[PDB]
Each structure stands twice: as C-alpha cells, then as structure tokens.
Amino acid sequence: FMAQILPIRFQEHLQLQNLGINPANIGFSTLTMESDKFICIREKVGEQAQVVIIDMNDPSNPIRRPISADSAIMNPASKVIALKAGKTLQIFNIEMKSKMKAHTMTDDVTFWKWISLNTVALVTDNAVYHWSMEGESQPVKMFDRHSSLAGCQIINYRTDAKQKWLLLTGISAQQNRVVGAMQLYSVDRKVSQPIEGHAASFAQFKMEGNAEESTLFCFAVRGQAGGKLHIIEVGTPPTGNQPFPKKAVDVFFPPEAQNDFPVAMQISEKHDVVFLITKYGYIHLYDLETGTCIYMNRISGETIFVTAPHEATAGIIGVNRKGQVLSVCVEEENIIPYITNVLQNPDLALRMAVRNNL
Ligand SMILES: O=[N+]([O-])c1ccc(NS(=O)(=O)c2ccc(Br)s2)cc1
C-alpha cells in the first residue's frame, strides 16, 4: 500500500566518466569531495601528473592543471586548495593564484581532511593536528593516537561544531572481517575513549523542553554482535538542559549481505535524520531523536567511497566507484505520509510535524 511514494528523493548529479575522468582514478586514494561544492581528482596522463577540479556549480567545464602532488583537497567553501608532496604541505588561494601558507612536517601525514571553512586536520602515525589556513600559525597537536588504531587504514576524521569532540576512524582486516576502530577525544577533559565503530557523525539537536542544543554523537557498527547504531550526548549538558537519553537500535542487513557493513554517515541538520550508507550501496534513514529506522534501500550498484552533507537539501551526496555522483534527501511532502501509512508510526509522524522543519 502506498508503495509509490518514498520518504526520500534520490538524484543523480553527474557521471564523472562522461567528463573525461579515467575510471582507475575514481577511488579513495585519488578522488576527494570535502564538501558538495567541488570534486578533486588526481590523474596521470602520459607521465604528466594532473589535478582535475570539478566545480559542482559548473561541472561541464572541469579545470585540468598539470600539478604533481600526493594528495589534493579543496576547501569546503572557498576556492582554496591544500596540496601535499612528501612531508611538505601547501595551501593555495586559487582565485588569487597565490600561495597562502606552507608547512613541513617531521612525520608523514597518512590522512588529512578539512574540518571547517578554515581548518585542515592532519593525521600522522601517532598524532592528530589542526592547521588553520589563516595567518602564520603552524599545525597544533590536538591529541596522541590511541594504540587501538595502530596499523589501521585511516578512513575518516571529524569533529562536533565547536571542535571540542574529535573523532578518528580507522579500519583493519581481521581474518576475513573489516573491523572499525574509533578514537573519541575530549578536548576539555584531555581524555580518549576507544570505540568499535565503522561510521559516525556529530549533530546538534534541541530536545523538547530544553532551551539549548545538545551535542550528539552517532555511530554505527557491524561487529560480532551484529549491526548496531548508537546516539549519545557527549559532554556535560548545557546548564538548564535535561540530558539526552542514550539510544541504541539494530542496523539491519539482509541474509544475502552477510559481508556488508557501514561505511558513511551524515546527519541532516534541518530534518534531524541520520543517513547511513553501507559498503554494498544501501542507504538507511534513522530518526535522530529515537533511532527509529525510517527507510532502507539499495541505491547504488557500486560502493560509495566518499560523502559530504548536501547543503541545499540537508541531505547526503556521494561518489561511487563508477563515477556516479548521487544524493539522497528527505522528501518533505511525502515523508510524513510514508511514516503514517507505510511505517505506521503516528508518534513519529506527530513529532516530525511538531518540529515543523519540512
Ligand atoms: O593552486 N593550484 O591548483 C596550484 C598551486 C600550486 C601549483 N604549483 S605546483 O608546483 O604544481 C605544486 C604541487 C604540489 C605542491 Br605541495 S605545490 C600548481 C597548482
């Protein structure tokens, strides 16, 4: 019944192979998408190393520049790029065709990522630094890496809005299993907590009855105990707030997907919904407040290896290994009809409408 309406809208935005991108470079090590504004691909044509920048507001005319770097990450908001070659890092102002700042590390940077409009996070074998793109400041060590991540492939680093809660995520192969290892660091308490988790995000959420927002930490994992999603308040609640009750729910995998697991998460600020993407290309939607599973479906035939918030829709945008750039967001006119008549959850239908953010 009502099978024709979904609580989501799926969109295809681009096919990178139609823009002259070699499929061999559509992957984690060579393609970055730090926000929904740009995609950056490192390619080698002949023996000329090149960087291709796709402006998502003008994607038919990508810029191909012969530059040699081990990694390239566009700023989330500005026409600014960070480039790395060996231990040397440089940030460039593209519009002004000028170098902004540079720094030479002592230890190799194995993973890096913009965490804000002006700060890039650097991960070495044993520590995590934050580096502002402004002024003269060098990178600042934020914390030392926990031993539980030793030997992991680092796959993500992200923070809460106030950059007081920092999360490093790695994976490792244990026999034929992919095991997630996370390090949650409190800047104020100077304490680390190891967590078995595969994908995660932070969110700000205003509880009914509270005047101030709660800082939530959501992570998903598939371990020996199966698929689980947790939603937790981190830190001391703002003065006057009631604490957010911890939520824990199952993450479902069908019998033919015993080897699937979570790989990406983004949270809608507007709709208080968690988007979870699995290795096999499934998307799940969960209510942030309760963890209720709203929707699941396989939306990609190829693995989606990078995601970002999709600002205009408060959704999630991602690139899959074939070069499809795709997004999922809440369908604002159909989600409450779906919850009412397919999920048959009038509590959630009511709570959603009361939030009145559709
Ligand atoms: O902003 N750019 O697109 C842009 C900025 C600087 C250059 N110079 S470079 O020698 O190729 C260079 C490569 C790696 C580092 Br690290 S510096 C080229 C392009």
Side-chain angles (χ1 to χ4, degrees):
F1 185 87
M2 196 156 274
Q4 83 280 6
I5 68 140
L6 303 180
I8 62 158
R9 178 188 182 188
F10 170 94
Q11 297 179 256
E12 174 179 307
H13 300 289
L14 286 174
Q15 292 281 353
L16 297 173
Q17 289 193 61
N18 293 346
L19 299 173
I21 301 304
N22 187 330
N25 300 315
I26 305 178
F28 178 82
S29 68
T30 51
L31 184 151
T32 61
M33 189 180 61
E34 300 282 277
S35 73
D36 68 4
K37 302 290 183 283
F38 305 99
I39 298 170
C40 186
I41 313 100
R42 294 186 307 112
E43 302 207 293
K44 186 78 92 94
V45 301
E47 200 133 27
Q48 181 179 118
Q50 303 174 332
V51 171
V52 185
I53 296 172
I54 302 168
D55 180 339
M56 296 300 285
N57 291 114
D58 190 1
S60 67
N61 308 114
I63 304 305
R64 184 179 290 270
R65 291 177 172 104
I67 97 88
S68 179
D70 304 326
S71 185
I73 46 170
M74 288 295 304
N75 184 274
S78 298
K79 295 182 173 186
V80 167
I81 193 161
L83 301 169
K84 154 164 147 266
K87 293 167 170 62
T88 295
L89 317 169
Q90 303 205 161
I91 304 173
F92 291 93
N93 184 328
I94 297 171
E95 181 175 357
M96 305 304 286
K97 303 171 178 176
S98 292
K99 183 173 66 180
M100 290 166 62
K101 54 203 294 203
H103 183 74
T104 299
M105 296 290 281
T106 292
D107 305 319
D108 287 330
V109 173
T110 61
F111 180 92
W112 64 344
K113 186 169 192 61
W114 293 96
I115 64 172
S116 76
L117 69 89
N118 60 32
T119 297
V120 65
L122 317 175
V123 182
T124 67
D125 284 331
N126 42 68
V128 170
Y129 306 73
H130 289 177
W131 192 26
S132 174
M133 80 186 190
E134 299 170 347
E136 302 292 320
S137 61
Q138 302 176 43
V140 177
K141 192 176 76 169
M142 306 302 295
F143 60 92
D144 297 310
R145 275 179 55 171
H146 194 277
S147 66
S148 59
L149 274 70
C152 288
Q153 178 186 27
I154 303 297
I155 59 162
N156 185 243
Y157 178 79
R158 66 190 318 163
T159 80
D160 74 321
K162 300 178 205 297
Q163 300 183 18
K164 295 292 189 163
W165 293 94
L166 320 176
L167 186 77
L168 181 66
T169 301
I171 52 174
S172 70
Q174 306 293 318
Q175 305 163 281
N176 59 359
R177 294 166 298 111
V178 181
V179 181
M182 288 177 172
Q183 178 176 1
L184 180 65
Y185 180 77
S186 171
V187 170
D188 287 341
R189 306 179 183 184
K190 298 185 175 65
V191 170
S192 287
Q193 182 170 336
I195 300 170
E196 184 185 358
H198 276 123
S201 189
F202 295 95
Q204 298 293 122
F205 179 71
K206 182 164 179 176
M207 296 164 63
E208 185 188 356
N210 282 353
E212 301 291 320
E213 288 176 339
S214 311
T215 299
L216 302 186
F217 167 56
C218 179
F219 76 94
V221 63
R222 192 187 193 167
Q224 310 295 84
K228 305 290 173 179
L229 186 134
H230 301 271
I231 306 171
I232 303 164
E233 182 176 25
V234 290
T236 42
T239 295
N241 268 24
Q242 292 301 134
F244 178 86
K246 247 157 60 181
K247 308 307 191 315
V249 300
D250 297 328
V251 174
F252 176 79
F253 295 92
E256 65 274 26
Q258 207 165 73
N259 288 106
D260 196 15
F261 57 100
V263 299
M265 184 182 290
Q266 305 290 350
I267 297 175
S268 175
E269 310 180 351
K270 186 179 195 291
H271 301 124
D272 300 314
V273 164
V274 181
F275 303 104
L276 185 66
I277 289 182
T278 77
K279 182 77 180 186
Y280 283 22
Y282 290 70
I283 193 149
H284 299 191
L285 269 69
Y286 299 88
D287 181 47
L288 181 61
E289 184 177 28
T290 66
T292 298
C293 186
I294 297 166
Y295 183 74
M296 302 177 281
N297 184 238
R298 190 170 188 233
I299 47 75
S300 182
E302 306 287 332
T303 299
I304 296 169
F305 61 93
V306 58
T307 70
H310 197 206
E311 179 173 33
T313 62
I316 182 169
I317 186 165
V319 188
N320 78 17
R321 285 191 64 255
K322 107 204 210 225
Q324 191 185 33
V325 183
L326 62 87
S327 66
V328 172
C329 65
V330 170
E331 217 297 344
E332 290 188 319
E333 292 295 343
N334 292 345
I335 183 160
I336 297 190
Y338 179 87
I339 289 171
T340 294
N341 298 296
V342 180
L343 273 185
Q344 304 205 248
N345 193 325
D347 274 352
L348 181 61
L350 282 163
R351 286 188 290 102
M352 271 211 177
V354 165
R355 290 193 281 274
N356 194 14
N357 292 326
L358 297 173

